[PDB]
Enzyme design. Structure first.
Site, PDB file in Angstrom:
ATOM      1  N   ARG A 274      -0.732 -11.147   3.171  1.00 31.03           N
ATOM      2  CA  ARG A 274      -1.827 -12.042   2.825  1.00 31.03           C
ATOM      3  C   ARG A 274      -2.474 -11.694   1.593  1.00 31.03           C
ATOM      4  NH1 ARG A 274      -6.304  -9.347   4.517  1.00 31.03           N
ATOM      5  NH2 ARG A 274      -5.954  -7.567   5.709  1.00 31.03           N
TER       6      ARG A 274
ATOM      7  N   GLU B   5       0.857  -1.310   0.059  1.00 27.93           N
ATOM      8  CA  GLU B   5       0.018  -0.063   0.183  1.00 27.93           C
ATOM      9  C   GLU B   5       0.825   1.256   0.011  1.00 27.93           C
ATOM     10  OE1 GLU B   5      -1.925  -0.164   3.650  1.00 27.93           O
ATOM     11  OE2 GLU B   5      -2.653  -2.172   3.498  1.00 27.93           O
TER      12      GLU B   5
END
Lengths: 246, 213
Positions: free
Chosen positions: A53, A35
């Site tokens: 994940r 991100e």
């Protein structure tokens, strides 16, 4: 959405090398997300968190790139190498973009009651599919019980389109088409997010949100049971030609 | 011109498309009404055939482009049961061979909206021989939209709304902008019960749960 609509092609190939740098600096196995915060004034990037994940939002990158994100994860720890026919992922030199998509998470967050969930028995559950609607649900159906101990996610509606805007009307059509009853829904909060002109053209920030018939069956039964006081004690019609309009 | 197949077959011979070798609607066969067999009109009955077809879209300005073929070999009592797209028995080289025949007939009719040119491949020889035209949308239309990225039902809408193929208002790209992504099939789920010679079942559905993803 996928890909990022408020981006260019140069902004597309900068966050792809930091992805290689952070996954190289950590001997990274499996799928994971990187991100970045972008100043809507300058356009830069800022390494926030990598999530090691698969995500609550993966499904929108699967519907454009044509690759099963989950199948890769399986071959990868099986022992398969990135790029082969048995890896499910093609080498970077093969991966490319193929339209526009967008997912809304349907939950039992009632728009019109302080975003507190509803509980218990759904007595109806109609989903919308049709062209360019991926569905990841299966937690919900007619008569099911939703208790309150977990995520109250009903389905994950994912609509794709030939273009970013035919994406929203497709999404807004599904979002509407849906029939859910027994427990409250954010569909009317979602249909208020995707038609608002700030989502339509990419002028949102991270503070877009935070800052923006029975009666009839009743009467019937009521009279079926007690009768109408203006008639109940008088002459009844013959046992009768319904009038027919000429 | 595309219902009477005593009056569409020579149109195929005209622009270059083959048809299965035959003779005119009555003065080694199969009997079609403009089904049974012979040992309407009569067509050289192909022994082992493969039902493959070009889907086309057409505007009011007079333009045509293929949406690539479909396989509909799998048939119970002669009807479509499994409907594919692309055609997996085709190498790429027979596909644009097939999609050139079809480009031209679609012209030869000044065609508006959705409609399929249909064919029949001889297993024995691997060649093509044209059959009929379905002049509308079909059941198997959906195996094309998904694998070709283009929304066909919307496109007959804008196509009849008045807009040029490959312009933002038609919902139809230009020729090489039409790319086949992967392969798609379609099976119809029916109240036909395989343990009651497929009789279809009527009744109330007390709980339904489909599979998506």
């Amino acid at each position: 959405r996928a890909p990022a609509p408020y981006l260019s092609e140069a902004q597309r190939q900068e966050l792809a090398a930091y992805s290689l740098k952070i996954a190289g600096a950590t001997n990274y196995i499996g799928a994971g997300t990187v991100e970045y915060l972008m100043d809507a004034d300058t356009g830069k990037f800022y390494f926030i968190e990598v999530n090691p994940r698969i995500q609550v939002e993966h499904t929108v990158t699967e519907v454009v790139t044509g690759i099963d994100i989950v199948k890769a994860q399986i071959h990868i720890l099986d022992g398969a190498a990135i790029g082969t026919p048995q890896s499910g992922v093609p080498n970077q030199e093969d991966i490319r973009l193929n339209g526009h998509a967008l997912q809304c998470r349907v939950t039992t967050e009632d728009p019109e009651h302080n975003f507190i969930p509803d509980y218990g028995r759904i007595t109806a559950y109609r989903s919308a599919s049709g062209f360019g609607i991926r569905l990841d649900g299966g937690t919900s159906y007619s008569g099911a019980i939703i208790t309150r101990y977990y995520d109250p996610l009903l389905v994950k509606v994912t609509a794709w389109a030939p273009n970013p805007l035919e994406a929203i009307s497709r999404m807004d059509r599904a979002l509407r088409e849906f029939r859910i009853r027994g427990v409250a829904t954010n569909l009317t909060f979602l249909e208020a997010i995707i038609g608002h002109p700030k989502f339509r053209d990419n002028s949102y920030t991270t503070r877009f949100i935070d800052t923006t018939a029975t009666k009839l069956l009743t009467y019937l039964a009521d009279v079926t049971v007690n009768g109408h006081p203006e008639a109940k004690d008088r002459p009844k019609p013959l046992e009768a030609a319904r009038p027919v309009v000429p | 011109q595309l219902g009477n197949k005593v009056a569409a077959r020579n149109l195929a011979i005209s622009v270059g498309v083959p048809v299965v070798p035959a003779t005119e609607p009555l003065p080694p066969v199969m009997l079609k009404a403009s089904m049974r067999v012979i040992r309407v009109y009569l067509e050289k009955l192909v022994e082992r055939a493969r039902h493959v077809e070009s889907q086309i879209l057409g505007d009011t300005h007079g333009n045509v482009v293929h949406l690539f073929e479909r396989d509909c070999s799998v048939q119970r009592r002669n009807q479509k049961v499994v409907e594919r797209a692309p055609a997996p028995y085709l190498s790429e080289a027979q596909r644009q061979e097939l999609a050139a025949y079809s480009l031209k007939i679609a012209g030869a009719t000044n065609y508006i909206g959705a409609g399929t040119v249909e064919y029949l491949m001889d297993a024995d020889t691997g060649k093509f021989y044209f059959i009929e035209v379905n002049p509308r949308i079909q059941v198997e239309h959906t195996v094309t939209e998904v694998v070709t990225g283009i929304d066909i039902v919307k496109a007959q809408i804008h196509i009849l709304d008045g807009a040029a193929i490959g312009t933002p208002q038609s919902g139809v790209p230009n020729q090489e902008d039409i790319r086949l992504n992967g392969h798609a099939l379609q099976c119809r789920v029916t109240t036909e019960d395989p343990e009651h010679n497929f009789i279809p079942d009527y009744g109330r559905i007390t709980a339904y749960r489909s599979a998506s993803g």
